[PDB]
Amino acid sequence: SEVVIVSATRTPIGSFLGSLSLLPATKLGSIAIQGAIEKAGIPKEEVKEAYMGNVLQGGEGQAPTRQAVLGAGLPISTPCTTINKVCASGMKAIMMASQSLMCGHQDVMVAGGMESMSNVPYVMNRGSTPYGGVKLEDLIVKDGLTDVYNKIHMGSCAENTAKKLNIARNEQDAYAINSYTRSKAAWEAGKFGNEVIPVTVTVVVVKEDEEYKRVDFSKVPKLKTVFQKENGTVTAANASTLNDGAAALVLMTADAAKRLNVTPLARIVAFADAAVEPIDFPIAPVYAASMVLKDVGLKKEDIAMWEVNEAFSLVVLANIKMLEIDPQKVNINGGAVSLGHPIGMSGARIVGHLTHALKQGEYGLASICNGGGGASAMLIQK
Amino acid sequence: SSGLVPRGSEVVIVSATRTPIGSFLGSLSLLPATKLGSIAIQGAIEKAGIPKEEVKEAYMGNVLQGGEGQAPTRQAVLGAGLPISTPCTTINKVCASGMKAIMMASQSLMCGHQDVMVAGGMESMSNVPYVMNRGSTPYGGVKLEDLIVKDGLTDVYNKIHMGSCAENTAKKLNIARNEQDAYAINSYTRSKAAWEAGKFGNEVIPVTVTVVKEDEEYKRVDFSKVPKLKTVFQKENGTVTAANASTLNDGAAALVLMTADAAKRLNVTPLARIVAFADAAVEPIDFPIAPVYAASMVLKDVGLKKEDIAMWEVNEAFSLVVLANIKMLEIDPQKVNINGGAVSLGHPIGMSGARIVGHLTHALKQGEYGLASICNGGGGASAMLIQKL
Amino acid sequence: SGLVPRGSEVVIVSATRTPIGSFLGSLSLLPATKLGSIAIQGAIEKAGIPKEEVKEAYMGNVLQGGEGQAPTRQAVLGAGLPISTPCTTINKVCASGMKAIMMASQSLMCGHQDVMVAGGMESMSNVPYVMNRGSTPYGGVKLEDLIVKDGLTDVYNKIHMGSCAENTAKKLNIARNEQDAYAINSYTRSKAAWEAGKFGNEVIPVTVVKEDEEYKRVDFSKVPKLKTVFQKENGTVTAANASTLNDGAAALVLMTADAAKRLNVTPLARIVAFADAAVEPIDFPIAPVYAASMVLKDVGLKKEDIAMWEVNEAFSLVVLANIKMLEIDPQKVNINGGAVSLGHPIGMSGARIVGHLTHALKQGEYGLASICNGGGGASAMLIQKL
Amino acid sequence: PRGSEVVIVSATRTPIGSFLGSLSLLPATKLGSIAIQGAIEKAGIPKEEVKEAYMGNVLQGGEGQAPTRQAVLGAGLPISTPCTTINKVCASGMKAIMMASQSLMCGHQDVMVAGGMESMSNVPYVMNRGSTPYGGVKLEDLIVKDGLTDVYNKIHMGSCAENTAKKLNIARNEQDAYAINSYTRSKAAWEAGKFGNEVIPVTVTVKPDVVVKEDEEYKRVDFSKVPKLKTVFQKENGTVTAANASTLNDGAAALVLMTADAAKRLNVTPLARIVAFADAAVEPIDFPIAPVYAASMVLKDVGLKKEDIAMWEVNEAFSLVVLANIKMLEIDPQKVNINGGAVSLGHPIGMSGARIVGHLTHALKQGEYGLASICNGGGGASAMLIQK
Numbered sequence A: 001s002e003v004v005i006v007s008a009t010r011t012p013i014g015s016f017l018g019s020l021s022l023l024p025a026t027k028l029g030s031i032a033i034q035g036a037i038e039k040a041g042i043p044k045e046e047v048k049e050a051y052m053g054n055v056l057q058g059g060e061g062q063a064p065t066r067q068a069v070l071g072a073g074l075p076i077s078t079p080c081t082t083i084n085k086v087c088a089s090g091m092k093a094i095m096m097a098s099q100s101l102m103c104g105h106q107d108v109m110v111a112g113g114m115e116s117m118s119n120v121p122y123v124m125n126r127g128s129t130p131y132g133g134v135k136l137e138d139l140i141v142k143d144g145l146t147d148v149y150n151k152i153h154m155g156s157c158a159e160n161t162a163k164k165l166n167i168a169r170n171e172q173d174a175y176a177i178n179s180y181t182r183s184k185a186a187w188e189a190g191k192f193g194n195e196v197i198p199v200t201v202t203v204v205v206v207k208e209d210e211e212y213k214r215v216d217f218s219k220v221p222k223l224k225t226v227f228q229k230e231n232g233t234v235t236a237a238n239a240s241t242l243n244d245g246a247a248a249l250v251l252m253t254a255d256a257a258k259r260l261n262v263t264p265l266a267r268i269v270a271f272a273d274a275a276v277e278p279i280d281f282p283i284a285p286v287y288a289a290s291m292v293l294k295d296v297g298l299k300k301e302d303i304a305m306w307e308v309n310e311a312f313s314l315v316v317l318a319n320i321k322m323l324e325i326d327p328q329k330v331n332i333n334g335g336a337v338s339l340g341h342p343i344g345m346s347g348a349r350i351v352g353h354l355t356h357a358l359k360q361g362e363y364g365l366a367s368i369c370n371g372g373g374g375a376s377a378m379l380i381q382k
Numbered sequence B: 001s002s003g004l005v006p007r008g009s010e011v012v013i014v015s016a017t018r019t020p021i022g023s024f025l026g027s028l029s030l031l032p033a034t035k036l037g038s039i040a041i042q043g044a045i046e047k048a049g050i051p052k053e054e055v056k057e058a059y060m061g062n063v064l065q066g067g068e069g070q071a072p073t074r075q076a077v078l079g080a081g082l083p084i085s086t087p088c089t090t091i092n093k094v095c096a097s098g099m100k101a102i103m104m105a106s107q108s109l110m111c112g113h114q115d116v117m118v119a120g121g122m123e124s125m126s127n128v129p130y131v132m133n134r135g136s137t138p139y140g141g142v143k144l145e146d147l148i149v150k151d152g153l154t155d156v157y158n159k160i161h162m163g164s165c166a167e168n169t170a171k172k173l174n175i176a177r178n179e180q181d182a183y184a185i186n187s188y189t190r191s192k193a194a195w196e197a198g199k200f201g202n203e204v205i206p207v208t209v210t211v212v213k214e215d216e217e218y219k220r221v222d223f224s225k226v227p228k229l230k231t232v233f234q235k236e237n238g239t240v241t242a243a244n245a246s247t248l249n250d251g252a253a254a255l256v257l258m259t260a261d262a263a264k265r266l267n268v269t270p271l272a273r274i275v276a277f278a279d280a281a282v283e284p285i286d287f288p289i290a291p292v293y294a295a296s297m298v299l300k301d302v303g304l305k306k307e308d309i310a311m312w313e314v315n316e317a318f319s320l321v322v323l324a325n326i327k328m329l330e331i332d333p334q335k336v337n338i339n340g341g342a343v344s345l346g347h348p349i350g351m352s353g354a355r356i357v358g359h360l361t362h363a364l365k366q367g368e369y370g371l372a373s374i375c376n377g378g379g380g381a382s383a384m385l386i387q388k389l
Numbered sequence C: 001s002g003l004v005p006r007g008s009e010v011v012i013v014s015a016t017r018t019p020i021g022s023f024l025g026s027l028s029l030l031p032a033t034k035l036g037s038i039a040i041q042g043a044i045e046k047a048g049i050p051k052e053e054v055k056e057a058y059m060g061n062v063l064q065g066g067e068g069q070a071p072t073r074q075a076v077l078g079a080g081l082p083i084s085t086p087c088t089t090i091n092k093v094c095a096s097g098m099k100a101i102m103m104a105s106q107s108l109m110c111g112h113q114d115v116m117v118a119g120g121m122e123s124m125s126n127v128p129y130v131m132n133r134g135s136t137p138y139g140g141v142k143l144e145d146l147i148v149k150d151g152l153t154d155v156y157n158k159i160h161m162g163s164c165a166e167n168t169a170k171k172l173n174i175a176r177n178e179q180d181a182y183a184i185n186s187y188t189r190s191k192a193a194w195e196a197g198k199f200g201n202e203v204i205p206v207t208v209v210k211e212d213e214e215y216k217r218v219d220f221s222k223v224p225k226l227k228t229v230f231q232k233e234n235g236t237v238t239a240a241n242a243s244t245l246n247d248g249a250a251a252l253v254l255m256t257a258d259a260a261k262r263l264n265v266t267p268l269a270r271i272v273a274f275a276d277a278a279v280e281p282i283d284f285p286i287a288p289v290y291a292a293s294m295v296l297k298d299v300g301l302k303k304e305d306i307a308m309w310e311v312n313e314a315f316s317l318v319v320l321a322n323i324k325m326l327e328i329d330p331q332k333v334n335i336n337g338g339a340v341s342l343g344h345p346i347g348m349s350g351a352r353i354v355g356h357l358t359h360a361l362k363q364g365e366y367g368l369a370s371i372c373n374g375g376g377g378a379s380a381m382l383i384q385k386l
Numbered sequence D: 001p002r003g004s005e006v007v008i009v010s011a012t013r014t015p016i017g018s019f020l021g022s023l024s025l026l027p028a029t030k031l032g033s034i035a036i037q038g039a040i041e042k043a044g045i046p047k048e049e050v051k052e053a054y055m056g057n058v059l060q061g062g063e064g065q066a067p068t069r070q071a072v073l074g075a076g077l078p079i080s081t082p083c084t085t086i087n088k089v090c091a092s093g094m095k096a097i098m099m100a101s102q103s104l105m106c107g108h109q110d111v112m113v114a115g116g117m118e119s120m121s122n123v124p125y126v127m128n129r130g131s132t133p134y135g136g137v138k139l140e141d142l143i144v145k146d147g148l149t150d151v152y153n154k155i156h157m158g159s160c161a162e163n164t165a166k167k168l169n170i171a172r173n174e175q176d177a178y179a180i181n182s183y184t185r186s187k188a189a190w191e192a193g194k195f196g197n198e199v200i201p202v203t204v205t206v207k208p209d210v211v212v213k214e215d216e217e218y219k220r221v222d223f224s225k226v227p228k229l230k231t232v233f234q235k236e237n238g239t240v241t242a243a244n245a246s247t248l249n250d251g252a253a254a255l256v257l258m259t260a261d262a263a264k265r266l267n268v269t270p271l272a273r274i275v276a277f278a279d280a281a282v283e284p285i286d287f288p289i290a291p292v293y294a295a296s297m298v299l300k301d302v303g304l305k306k307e308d309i310a311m312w313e314v315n316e317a318f319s320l321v322v323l324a325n326i327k328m329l330e331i332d333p334q335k336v337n338i339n340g341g342a343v344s345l346g347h348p349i350g351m352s353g354a355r356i357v358g359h360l361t362h363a364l365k366q367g368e369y370g371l372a373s374i375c376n377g378g379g380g381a382s383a384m385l386i387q388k
């Protein structure tokens, strides 16, 4: 049977070395899982399998998704799998659980994503120490943010796209400022009340994303470009930040929803993956969103809300340009530039956000790129 | 049956290929897991006799991804010369990882979302790094943890080694040091026999290392030493040794999976049909019993009985895991791991679940049912039933 | 456990029918095939699709003699459907209208067709008499009534369908009393539905006939006075409490879920499951009990999960036997009347009752239609509204 | 074959009797009991394994209630067997096989009997219900009215045949060269034992039994009279005669069908797999060329080409029909109706479609592809592709 999102919940997003930095990604995962099952109004026993996206798994201990599940009090008998599709991971987890549900292999799943960038370690190779020194690599840079083929940062890939599509620093800064503004408005206006579950840190109660407050509008046009010396557009204010957080969605068949007498928030309509040249990852979401629209036969103007994950302001701007969509329909309550971006979580966060912000009958399209030249996109309706 | 809509056509396996399994810091140690990945994948596409442009999506198991670089499955794919258009996803269900990637690729084909994929598994234990926490260096020093021990082999909840959980199951089920040792030299024998016999000529593809045609581990044996080795995970009254536990290894395995329409459209004849599969989970410490339940589940549905299976591949994470499965299932030990397995062939941990499925593919004669099962740390297991031709 | 999932269900997009005319009554001038044309044309209309999207037609039709060549082809071409649409006439005696929907469904499930019309037709007014070919025997020649010979006589017991019913009344102790009360309940339920306008959805006026003729032909005072026509002495079955001989056609547009999407059409109902059962020829009245049981068993549904039962009223006796053995709520059975009051054009009835559930069920409700047939068979269909 | 793929496990028939001839004393339902009972014996399965039966039967008037149920119960099959009688006029016996194959494919049954039966000898005359009109009434012949008259054009099938002769230009002579080509092919086949697995003799019992063992019709020729006969469906300019048209006949045919899985469970070796099938329809008057479209449909469906077909059975409703088919398909005439057809063997309407499939089943060599097609009244055709 058809896939329904029964609930969608997430921790706040904390800053790098910030308010959630004491919590492992797996704990953040448990908090969001518990909060999700709670909001669904179903027995914890009902959840049969779990997929969690988690990009930087080194040092987290054996089977991270199993840790998240068992630390949320879900049954011992729940199978668990950790998904890695770089920034798309959180979305890919929901896609893969939707497939399992559709197949009939499960009736009720949890799916989402978790990341604690604050706790990602450094690595030293196993082997004989080279004469003249030993390297100690940062796993965030090495596995998170470095393109393998070009050997440049993701920010430098963004720059390649900014040049190719003539998106200037001016338009990127305006967008970054716009995300902060939309993020502040949305929080003041309690738009995240239903989405976010507060986290009490026991050494301290965190109930709000901390990143959007870390802004000074006048500094923005003054910042040096980080990924490129001259003719650079991408800066620390206009690029997403490194963050900690977790998201969880309770998914089930329409039939399981009827059986358990629960009222689905949204139905999953369609989803797709696309891949392009590794360097071109910013536009991969264009092709993934297009595949979803073609497949179900809708056109751009039929969707009420777009969530093009804000990896860089440049990315959203590239998508709006190529898809010729109404920029006032995109990332309307902020996004990763001002909310932050715990890599394995963001794909799930953006689906969870559509689930809550869309009005009855409306179509929401979530898209997200990933290191390697990839993207996922998902179409939901309420 | 009463007017229910028929089930669609099944997913087929049209090629199974792998690298040989290298020893820890042995023959294949200079190769990253994603390179071994690209070799096994390239090899599967070649054996399928299809254009590489036909593979639509790839899933690889890979448990210890630390230091491998961004998107390890995508590295393996683009390194195998597949198109920049191929979506890629790396999967971690700790030892069940390689099997779970085939289960999940299967589900995608059954939904009609793809018509052809590669699914497999890859591990280079030789190249798994050590880690240091981010933050301030504590006064008095720090111990850089080994990721094999810390993310691979340590149970989180009980704070003990996989080998020590196996010990807790040996005690419960009366599985003595003696049986474990016999099963072990048994495995080493079968591996030897099977390589002599030419059994691995279709699956194993050779690797050329520049600055290996055969598995290396099965030749790493001393039958006289076995009964007088120290019990390495338990002090006194132990049963598990370095000889009857599996080793740390490097290796990749990949399979081409297809719908029956894609098999028709490219006029390839499948090697095997995937029948059923299931995941089970129990108490973390009891991971060695979990594979019995997954395999029960796969037999319950489809309505077969254990005597219907020609070949069992129960991963030898420990000789005791295999033995404890045999005990509870009451199956014919002469039908289990008949060309050997992990204890003697090696256990490159993300690769194994894919290796055993791919081996059943090559070994079952026409009409035969093969059951593959595999435990994973955490309390889990994955099980798959295939049928030859 | 990793079993390949089941395909998409077959959906019912429209379901229409002519009024049911009385024997030699108001539709008696029209051949069964003309009735089929009318039902089919209206079904296509109600569905909202081009005629040319219909790929194939199966129509039940029991008494084919005299209708001319390929009756279903006649109905189909008489409705203006393409000359390229293949036509087959089905005969499973009183199950034929339902067996035609079942078979069309199987074709849909196989991917052999994407859109079909299925239903049934009968003009019992125009059923001929027959005379054997060969030599006239000395002393007189018999002209047999095909209604009697091919329609209503059990081959094996050489008795009327009505006498088989008597066998069950006896076996299960269903008295003339229960049967007459049931028949009167069908007449009142019929009239009530017609006046409510409960058939405004399914019935296509024939143009002059707008409404089922049979439900008005009743006299309540005469009911306990009637003769037991199938067994003199101790009988229970009478003309009031047995179904009547009638004229009518019913048609449904069946589609795959893809074809409904492609055609931008919203399905009335899903076909969930269906089966045929058979018992000893004389025992046909209980056969629907077994067919419906197998349908419920297969979908792991329980008898209480069913909102509305349509158990064809061949005889008041059949419905009562089914109610007794299924142990189901009489108030959920044949709620808007049935064949005793509405009439029974034998090839049409199994289609009509499916069509009726599709309009009468409320969203998400399950309905179960069952119908006995001559020779000891029965068919049953489970559908779900929306 | 494997799983739900459909296989033919046996195929048998009665002899075909002549109109008012060898088998004329048996009702079509009895012929059907004989063929069903025979096909099950040859299947080598218990009769309780057959779960459902479909029988083609075109002229059902006066046969009594539920003719397929009569055929089934008369073969001694259990009373739990559902039965349905199928009418697609001369495609009926093939459509029964196609419909049974869909049930099997769907998983709703695992083992079925499908075939067809017809006793044209016993088809009655009909009299309208109601008031007898002053001045009398012609009692119509059901064979003519329901079997052989096109509703729309209001003419005999034979006259629809003359339409396609004048059009494809099929002269009389090509036509009854074909008819003697058929009588010859049948005689050889019979003499050479070629129907020995396929046909099972009928013991007609009365009140001193008589055993009918051979198709009765193929002896009734005279290669010398053929070019001399009156064109019976058209005075001026005709081409179809009694010699070059099929005759009216009695016979029945049954096939045991099952899934490849059921064959494996029951430990029996199937004869052929049903690869694919189709129906097509054109203008009623043009029925003789409908099998052209139905045959191409199955070939197209399956990616096979006309030359990969080892044997064709194009039912011989008229010599005209096979020639039009040979013509439009551009097919080798030596691969068509190789052992004779309905012109010389006879044509029990509801049976012929099952006969031609049953025939391919026996005559094909291993791995070979057979294609059966058959036209029907109202402008339809059915076609089935089989592999041995």
Ligand SMILES: CC(C)(COP(=O)(O)OP(=O)(O)OC[C@H]1O[C@@H](n2cnc3c(N)ncnc32)[C@H](O)[C@@H]1OP(=O)(O)O)[C@@H](O)C(=O)NCCC(=O)NCCS
Residues within 6 Å of the ligand: A087, A145, A154, A155, A214, A215, A216, A217, A219, A220, A223, A226, A235, A236, A237, A238, A239, A240, A241, A242, A311, A312, A341, A370, A371
């Ligand atoms: C860009 C990045 C390198 C930040 O590093 P950094 O330059 O050291 O960050 P800083 O906080 O020091 O930023 C530099 C300056 O910008 C300022 N700043 C950052 N965001 C600002 C904002 N929103 N408004 C005003 N000032 C801001 C800082 O105050 C700092 O100013 P200072 O020099 O006077 O102190 C890092 O966040 C990154 O790698 N982001 C990309 C994440 C990514 O690629 N995600 C994956 C998606 S594919």
Ligand SMILES: CC(C)(COP(=O)(O)OP(=O)(O)OC[C@H]1O[C@@H](n2cnc3c(N)ncnc32)[C@H](O)[C@@H]1OP(=O)(O)O)[C@@H](O)C(=O)NCCC(=O)NCCS
Residues within 6 Å of the ligand: B095, B153, B162, B163, B220, B221, B222, B223, B225, B226, B229, B232, B241, B242, B243, B245, B246, B247, B248, B317, B318, B347, B349, B377
């Ligand atoms: C067992 C393990 C801890 C290795 O530790 P180790 O004892 O230091 O390994 P060694 O090779 O040094 O073994 C010690 C002795 O056993 C001997 N041994 C190893 N293989 C042998 C063979 N097959 N025949 C006879 N003796 C053998 C060695 O020769 C050595 O002898 P020595 O001490 O006299 O020189 C390690 O391989 C491990 O953690 N395995 C488990 C992996 C696992 O659980 N996989 C995941 C599934 S849950």
Ligand SMILES: CC(C)(COP(=O)(O)OP(=O)(O)OC[C@H]1O[C@@H](n2cnc3c(N)ncnc32)[C@H](O)[C@@H]1OP(=O)(O)O)[C@@H](O)C(=O)NCCC(=O)NCCS
Residues within 6 Å of the ligand: C094, C151, C152, C161, C162, C217, C218, C219, C220, C222, C223, C226, C229, C238, C239, C240, C241, C242, C243, C244, C245, C314, C315, C344, C373, C374
């Ligand atoms: C029952 C059947 C034999 C008709 O019987 P009939 O006696 O020939 O028909 P009649 O109309 O003359 O009915 C006899 C009497 O019943 C009366 N009547 C019939 N139905 C009545 C009712 N609904 N209420 C009051 N009176 C009724 C008539 O007025 C007539 O009365 P009268 O002659 O004493 O004045 C015939 O319709 C039949 O065989 N139906 C059964 C259908 C069947 O077998 N089912 C399908 C196969 S399972």
Ligand SMILES: CC(C)(COP(=O)(O)OP(=O)(O)OC[C@H]1O[C@@H](n2cnc3c(N)ncnc32)[C@H](O)[C@@H]1OP(=O)(O)O)[C@@H](O)C(=O)NCCC(=O)NCCS
Residues within 6 Å of the ligand: D090, D148, D157, D158, D220, D221, D222, D223, D225, D226, D229, D232, D241, D242, D243, D244, D245, D246, D247, D248, D317, D318, D347, D377
């Ligand atoms: C044609 C039909 C009406 C037969 O009627 P008929 O012509 O009076 O039958 P007959 O037996 O008298 O045949 C006429 C002559 O042909 C002769 N004959 C029959 N077959 C012959 C042959 N193969 N070779 C030589 N002579 C033959 C007869 O001896 C007879 O000659 P006669 O008058 O000198 O004695 C009848 O068979 C029919 O309607 N067939 C049509 C089949 C059909 O349409 N089937 C449905 C498919 S769409």
Ligand SMILES: [Cl-]
Residues within 6 Å of the ligand: A066, A078, A079, A080, A081, B280, B281, B376, B378, B379, B380, B381
């Ligand atoms: Cl698990």
Ligand SMILES: [Cl-]
Residues within 6 Å of the ligand: C277, C278, C373, C375, C376, C377, C378, D069, D081, D082, D083, D084
């Ligand atoms: Cl029946």
Ligand SMILES: [Cl-]
Residues within 6 Å of the ligand: C073, C085, C086, C087, C088, D280, D281, D376, D378, D379, D380, D381
């Ligand atoms: Cl037709």
